[PDB]
């Protein structure tokens, strides 16, 4: 679970930087692929 | 919609008539441009 | 995997429109063509089990 960082804390979440981070082969969203206020992020890896 | 006006071989009479509905096509395709077809 | 669903599109559909197209969709900022770092196939299947 690589630490389950709770990303949300409080802050502006800019998701477009993720395309700049690395080339990807998968990005499967069950919500909205072009990305809202969600209160919690609960990121893990 | 269409009208046939047998109505002055070339000149316009500056008349007035309505087009009755003719055909309903349930295609569902995005249309932004069109072209005519000539023989 | 016979049933395909669209997950990525440039804009929303209008009522009763169809979009039978496989053209590669660019999701990221860097221009690309074909499959690649910022280019995804617009359709995905649900392997119903």
From Swiss-Prot, chain A:
Lineage top rank: taxon: Viruses
Function according to Swiss-Prot or TrEMBL: Attaches the virion to the cell membrane by interacting with host receptor, initiating the infection. The major receptor is host ACE2. When S2/S2' has been cleaved, binding to the receptor triggers direct fusion at the cell membrane. When S2/S2' has not been cleaved, binding to the receptor results in internalization of the virus by endocytosis using host TFRC and GRM2 and leading to fusion of the virion membrane with the host endosomal membrane. Alternatively, may use NRP1/NRP2 and integrin as entry receptors.
What does the annotation say about its assembly with partners?
A: Binds to host ACE2. RBD also interacts with the N-linked glycan on 'Asn-90' of ACE2. Cleavage of S generates a polybasic C-terminal sequence on S1 that binds to host Neuropilin-1 (NRP1) and Neuropilin-2 (NRP2) receptors. Interacts with host integrin alpha-5/beta-1 (ITGA5:ITGB1) and with ACE2 in complex with integrin alpha-5/beta-1 (ITGA5:ITGB1). May interact via cytoplasmic c-terminus with M protein. May interact (via N-terminus) with host bilirubin and biliverdin, thereby preventing antibody binding to the SARS-CoV-2 spike NTD via an allosteric mechanism.
> Can you say what this protein is called?
Spike protein S1
Please give the organism: Severe acute respiratory syndrome coronavirus 2 (2019-nCoV)
UniProtKB/Swiss-Prot annotation, chain C:
Q: What is the effect of changing residue 41 to S?
A: In strain: Lambda/C.37, Omicron/BQ.1.1, Omicron/XBB.1.5, Omicron/EG.5.1
- What would changing residue 47 to S do, according to UniProt? In strain: Omicron/BA.1
**Result after altering residue 41 to L:** Increased resistance to neutralizing antibodies and human covalescent sera neutralization
Q: Explain what the record says happens when changing residue 5 to F.
A: Decreased HLA binding to NF9 epitope. Increased binding affinity to human ACE2
Chain spans, region Immunodominant HLA epitope recognized by the CD8+: 1-8
| Residue ranges of the region described as Disordered | 7-41
Which residue ranges does the record annotate as region Receptor-binding motif? 1-49
Q: Which cysteines are joined by disulfide bonds?
A: 32-39
Q: What does this protein do?
A: Attaches the virion to the cell membrane by interacting with host receptor, initiating the infection. The major receptor is host ACE2. When S2/S2' has been cleaved, binding to the receptor triggers direct fusion at the cell membrane. When S2/S2' has not been cleaved, binding to the receptor results in internalization of the virus by endocytosis using host TFRC and GRM2 and leading to fusion of the virion membrane with the host endosomal membrane. Alternatively, may use NRP1/NRP2 and integrin as entry receptors.
The protein's assembly and partners: Binds to host ACE2. RBD also interacts with the N-linked glycan on 'Asn-90' of ACE2. Cleavage of S generates a polybasic C-terminal sequence on S1 that binds to host Neuropilin-1 (NRP1) and Neuropilin-2 (NRP2) receptors. Interacts with host integrin alpha-5/beta-1 (ITGA5:ITGB1) and with ACE2 in complex with integrin alpha-5/beta-1 (ITGA5:ITGB1). May interact via cytoplasmic c-terminus with M protein. May interact (via N-terminus) with host bilirubin and biliverdin, thereby preventing antibody binding to the SARS-CoV-2 spike NTD via an allosteric mechanism.
Can you name this protein? Answer: Spike protein S1
Can you name the source organism? Answer: Severe acute respiratory syndrome coronavirus 2
- Give the source lineage, highest ranks first: Viruses, Riboviria, Orthornavirae, Pisuviricota, Pisoniviricetes
